[PDB]
Symmetry: D4
Subunit: 182 residues, 8 copies
């Protein structure tokens, strides 16, 4: 969820079948990508991918995608116990984000099992863990994320919105926070 | 930096590509850096415009993260929070999202545990450990120099002496010169 | 890349600031990257001029290192060496400093253990493990596609079938299209 | 000895007493430096420091210096058991590279002990470990570094130099290597 | 043991030196072993008398702990709980302190999430992951043998065949003999 | 709090100043102990110490004491950030458990600071963290320890005790648990 | 090669299909064993197995065998990259030590591949690594093991044996060592 | 023990089950302990008889090992060797197999680098680091007490004073009593 490299943009130096090399500031970044994302990319031209940076004791890796929503879905898959980055990429290479989303949403285990490395029991854990996972609400969420409880988060938010109808998401949040700081 | 060491990425500047509620993406040299930030810092930021945030880089076996702030003082305060046992980066960000640096500073300074407990994840006993550990920690020529010496390992006593001698002999002395003169003497030459 | 995974820095390009005998410093965006390289690769490099090396990034708990080479094939060969148990980055660099990629390739291919043993740190039993592990490993439309599928986890049998079907239906097929068509079928849709 | 970031160049954004911030490509790099190196630096101007990058499980740090020789001396200090980066920086902040070099060379333990954190027994281990440590030879060394033994390294080198008097360090090394590949 | 591997200390027997509410100390060979146990298991234990508990040994970088139970089945159930992601030893002990093995078994078997949620630290979504992962997991001659084969790596298909052949030829067969005969055949001899 | 070796009993083979060797079943266990605990021990005779077993990646160590209460106080000291086993032993070697207890209880920082390695700010963190730390209640605690909340723990307990006055600590706990299993 | 628990002896409390529990001094040790070794064991009776102790960050495990030679072969299998304890046990459960030995010795890859988890390329690495691996010599070896080189080891040994014909393995080694200490 | 800390298994006693050339197996309480030992220590050992070795227990992430010796002094010397950077357990055993403790002691004491270099794995520069680090380290009532105090963290100055005062007042003083009296005073009571 929190990493450092959120995207890479610059000249495509190489399109392979499971990754691309994008040169930013003379540095050529290898970012792994599905064949679908890769097909939109042309060597010699400038591109931008939205990335998830993965840091392990013995590796550092970029996984890239067309948009933040797809990148966030990738991270979401990684939140399932037993689902690592390769598998998550595998899954998205077989089912594009929309299709992967609906499969999970509809609990389509047969679809899921079509992915190498996802057995039936694995498919089910995924569906179970992810089924539900695929102004006012965003704000409540931010508060919750900061540690606040749904109850109190909602109340500060409703009060803030009530007093100020022009409120944007950020202002609402800063007003709510200010009240919660009590 | 502050009571939380030395890191590599001290700031990121360039085009704001995205303002979310708990982070921004700032593009430097085609690289889009995610830096986590309070809603207060975030509000000054506009997508499509250039921005600069002063950052703390956090390195763990399984992650690397930037936390960003309007100024070095606020960034140093964040690092300072992390020096308390049981206070990690999320919580420290949490604390600063609820109380802006000035307010957080005074709370700690005044030992306002009630204020502190208003932060999700900070209980009363946690609040107190914080106040205790940080009360004196929140906040000239002669003093900065002594501190640099102390930081290098020198003892207050000897550090102050080298510094007073140096400043006595040279009244024009700047902080760096004073420090280099003091060091020279302490090297016993 | 090769039998040694996926990393982040695939190349570095910019001004050569220093050519030493076992590495060069290439400045990209004001950042001077040390990349280790064979004397052979180094000789093509001139300080003061712009260069580009294709790199393997190595990440360990206590280090981060770039190894650089003239082309992707040579870089992939390096990674391949690292896939042998007991062969680390220094040794692999050592091996390529003594035998250039082509020669190293043929040595392994021909199982030339005497050639191999000429490398400091490669004994006879080490040489043999290498030849054994790498003999078939050194080195189209249909085959690259099958391989990508296999890499994604698919079995040779099914991978070849999807691929032949795809190529049969579409003779204009490129490697990527073939792969996307094959994948689509394998998704069973 | 082998790390990734060998220098940082760009605009000085801040000079402190124990570090500087140098902005390269919009990225502000904190590099720790002695008060001596720091004094040559002016905020608002472009600078370049030669750096040692230090990577630990829980940190990544740049230590900067005016030249490669000084940076290499820093790394050399770290090769002594018990001498970490802070201490090494401490040592160089008290004795500039030349002076530190001579102290070690002359085994001046009293000088050495003037450094906070270096006791007499520590001073001695240092002197002992480092006393000796502060065309034809460079080449032999490269070969040795690659794993070759002094004996054979010297022989390939002498033979190469003998046959080609115009030989540069790199050519000699590539010729020697070629012979050694036998 | 169960879905939680292989360990070294499978039981401890000797004099009860102390019965507390969440552990007992049992002295074997002058060594006093602390073994953590449910209040239910603890109640059968009397200081000054000899006892034997069947244990799971837990080894972590910074700890070594014994958890003890009246029988192997209960101990195996504990290990099984630990196979669920997010369920550690304290929680598993917690769960068994609230629902005795039989009751815990049935709860999981019947997917009784309400029962499960009665356990501190088990939320509804946690309860469900448990039920899902463990529903089939709670609970002959031919079957134990097949399982041992499977455990050794053999596939159900081939494991069953070797086993049926073995049992057909030898009706007197015990579980071990069957397994050794089956193995012998599978070695293809 | 939970470790494996809770005591060692058998023949004293050696009494040193900072540890003893106690032989159980032909195995000679080194257990570190304060000079006070050590003085009660005689080589050639049988002894029993109550121990805390400490397991780290690169060591395994027994610390022994006359009784469980003293052993538990040792573990309690280790719960303070910055206080490791040596220091904790140091502290108890300077102030016996009772005295150490009261010092902490009375916030006697001067007393505390008399311990090598405990500065004033360290002394205070200790006092702060430990000041409060030195049938019905034990039961509530067990329940709380199992994860139950004070409120509900107390209620199950009071109800159990009310219905059964003969109740022992264990029975009360098993009855309470049974109700809480609902 | 060097571990702590070299055998366990005492009452068999349980014989399963993939392990036994042997109670020594009131402690019940689980030792994993092949079905062949297990068949010689009877619950209620005393037994002794020769064991390899395996220590990992997150586990400690005993693997037992009838004799030291079989236990040493197990450790030998573990010296192959890619062959862990389960697999090694698997291998010995399919081919008894003698048969496993000869298979490796004869490079019988087909035999080897009959083991679940051993593919052809795995089988070959094994054969390659292990083919050769299955008074005077033992002594030379001990010396070599201590770090001495074959040449010098043999010479000290021959000289020692020459002077003393009655020499046992240990005496020869102690005499040789004494000479080598020069 | 010595300059190598505190461990758990300080000795093993019981029946010798096997004498090999670089280790013995000693059975205590049905448990057969492998303890590694020099050929010199091994020679005093007879299979079938009871023996006792004084041991250093070595704990690493991936191993646990006993090294054994005739007496505590020799065991402490071994631990002392391990305090030298670059000297691990095998090498230390190696060193003691070539030079018995007394001889190893004197070699170090006399700085006999030639003797030292006779050990496989000890080069000249290694020999010297050893001599340097250990020269003073090889080897009363008042002194042992001061040392215990120092070990507890007290400074030589204050440690000696408490000790001299204690011994002055009580001439009958034993090492332990002296230490407990000294400690009592230092507690400032």
């Amino acid at each position: 969820s929190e990493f450092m490299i959120a995207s890479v943009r610059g000249e495509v130096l190489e399109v392979a079948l499971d990754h691309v090399v994008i040169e930013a500031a003379g540095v050529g970044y290898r970012v792994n990508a599905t064949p679908a994302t890769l097909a939109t990319l042309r060597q010699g031209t400038e591109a931008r991918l939205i990335t998830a940076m993965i840091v392990r004791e013995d590796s550092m890796t970029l996984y890239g995608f067309p948009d933040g929503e797809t990148r966030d879905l990738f991270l979401t898959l990684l939140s399932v116990s037993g689902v690592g980055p390769r598998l998550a990429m595998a899954a998205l290479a077989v089912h594009d984000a929309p299709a992967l989303r609906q499969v999970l949403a509809d609990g389509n285990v047969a679809a899921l099992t079509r992915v190498p490395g996802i057995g039936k029991r694995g498919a089910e854990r995924m569906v179970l863990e992810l089924r539900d996972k695929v102004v006012r609400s965003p704000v409540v969420e931010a508060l919750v994320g900061l540690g606040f409880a749904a109850k109190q988060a909602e109340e500060a938010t409703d009060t803030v919105l009530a007093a100020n109808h022009d409120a944007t998401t950020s202002s609402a949040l800063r007003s709510a926070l200010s009240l919660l700081g009590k």
